[PDB]
């Protein structure tokens, strides 16, 4: 009956509304896993930089074009790469010669392209996030992968030719491959953080 | 009884070529108009006492070359462009002394133009990562032995349909060539084979897409994409 919001994160994810919307029949069903780091104590966690991986599975040799939004708890501090980017490509994108991380406040937009279906399974992107000095036991800093769309452009996960199966794979990715308000996490830390639309987190065990 | 001559009708014949434009451009190029000849038809005759007009002869005066006098009036790419699925061609009326002209068949004389969004390789009225990939894919294909602009199609659009010699592939190339080393000296009339469509074009476009997708540049991309293109190509 009461409405609950996360401490320092908003739910920007939108309803996947391209046809086909239902990706259940997709030949390729990609799933993106995000790091869930748990510290035993505040002292263990305070001021730590954590490598957060965004890892795809189930799509080896089956995608080429991607673009999705990542956001994180505003209390976390992002540690930029040597170029100033908030994210760094991983081995999953090694054969994709187009890859670009674009900074976006408490988040980043990450995209890739390839001249064939050279997308691979594994780590697509890493982001280093630093835990605040004043972190306390019980704290959860959620990390969200979100689908966004507007009439000018939208987020993507498709094959080189953007085929019918590419579009089915895309719908699967955004509706079943990641968490969102329509596919909520049941992870206890995310429930506690009131951020079940989110995907991973850095958490500190309860006292 | 008194015989006079008067213009009965007047029409133009025009030889013109296609022109490609970005939706942001403020001017069509009259260079599309190669030649325009104005024909003027006269009737000579009289009105009888019974008030009935009699025509004794029909003829034209010497046709006049008016090529240089033709304008497109107030029409511009920016004020003509409409995003419509699988539809990029427009017929732009020519003007002569601030009035339209009729062609030989009685219709307003027009010139064909194609107008699209810079970066929109696949011709779907959207600039996104798929356009970057298509551009990259074309570069990789044409960089392979035994392949070039003549055997490879650039655009995934159904309008091209895999056809390397489609005019829409020339149009797609024009839209995709966001990085032109030659500058203005390579004109909008260049064909796909005359352009360099490479990984630099593809990475710009991708960056345009990524910047459009974050809060800082969302509105710039939508409202004045040209300022964002300049940023992503290093020209500003
Ligand atoms: Ca999410
Ligand atoms: Ca497009
Ligand atoms: Ca180029």
TrEMBL record, chain A:
The keyword Acyltransferase does not apply. One of its GO terms (molecular function) is carbohydrate binding. Keywords: Calcium, Membrane, Metal-binding, Signal, Transmembrane, Transmembrane helix. Ca(2+) binds at residues 144-145, 179, 197, 199. This is Cell-wall anchoring protein. The chain holds residues 29 to 228 of 330 of the full protein.
Automatic annotation (TrEMBL), chain B:
Ca(2+) 1 binds at residues 120, 122, 124, 126, 131. Ca(2+) 2 binds at residues 177, 179, 181, 196, 201. Residues 19-97 form the Cellulose-binding protein CttA N-terminal domain. It comes from the Bacteria. This is Putative cellulose-binding protein. It comes from Ruminococcus flavefaciens.
């Amino acid at each position: 009956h009461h409405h609950h919001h996360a401490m320092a994160l908003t739910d920007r994810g939108m309803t996947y509304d391209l046809d086909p919307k239902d990706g259940s029949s997709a030949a390729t069903k990609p799933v993106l896993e995000v790091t869930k780091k748990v510290f035993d104590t505040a002292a263990d966690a305070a001021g730590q930089t954590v490598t957060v991986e965004f890892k795809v599975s189930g799509a080896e040799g089956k995608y080429a074009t991607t673009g999705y939004h990542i956001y994180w708890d505003e209390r976390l501090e992002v540690v930029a790469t040597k170029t100033g980017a908030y994210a760094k490509k991983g081995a999953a994108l090694e054969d994709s010669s187009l890859a670009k991380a674009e900074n976006n406040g408490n988040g980043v937009f990450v995209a890739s392209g390839a001249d064939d279906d050279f997308g691979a399974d594994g780590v697509m992107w890493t982001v280093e996030l630093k835990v605040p000095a004043d972190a306390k036991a019980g704290d959860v800093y959620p990390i969200d992968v979100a689908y966004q769309w507007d009439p000018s452009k939208g987020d993507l996960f498709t094959d080189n030719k953007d085929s019918a199966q590419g579009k089915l794979m895309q719908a699967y990715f955004f509706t079943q491959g990641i968490k969102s308000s329509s596919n909520p996490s049941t992870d206890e830390y995310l429930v506690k953080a009131n951020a079940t639309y989110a995907d991973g987190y850095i958490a500190i065990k309860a006292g | 009884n008194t015989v006079t001559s008067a213009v009965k009708t007047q029409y133009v014949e025009i030889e013109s070529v296609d022109g490609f434009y970005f939706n942001t451009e403020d001017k069509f190029d009259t260079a599309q108009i190669k030649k325009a000849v104005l024909h003027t038809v006269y009737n000579e005759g009289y009105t009888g006492d019974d008030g009935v007009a009699v025509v004794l002869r029909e003829y034209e005066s010497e046709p006049v070359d008016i090529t240089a006098e033709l304008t497109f009036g107030d029409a511009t790419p920016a004020n003509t462009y409409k995003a419509v699925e699988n539809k990029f061609d427009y017929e732009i009326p020519v003007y002569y002394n601030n009035a339209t002209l009729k062609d030989a068949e009685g219709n307003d004389a027009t010139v064909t133009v194609y107008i699209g969004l810079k970066g929109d390789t696949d011709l779907n009225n959207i600039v996104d990562g798929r356009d970057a990939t298509a551009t990259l894919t074309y570069y990789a294909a044409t960089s392979t032995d035994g392949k070039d602009a003549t055997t490879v199609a650039l655009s995934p659009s159904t309008l091209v349909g895999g056809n390397p010699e489609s005019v829409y592939d020339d149009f797609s190339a024009f839209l995709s060539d966001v990085k032109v080393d030659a500058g203005k000296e390579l004109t909008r009339f260049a064909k796909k084979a005359e352009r360099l469509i490479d990984g630099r074009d593809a990475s710009s476009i991708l960056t345009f897409y990524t910047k459009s997708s974050v809060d800082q540049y969302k509105d710039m991309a939508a409202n004045e994409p040209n300022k964002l293109w300049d940023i992503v190509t290093g020209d500003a």
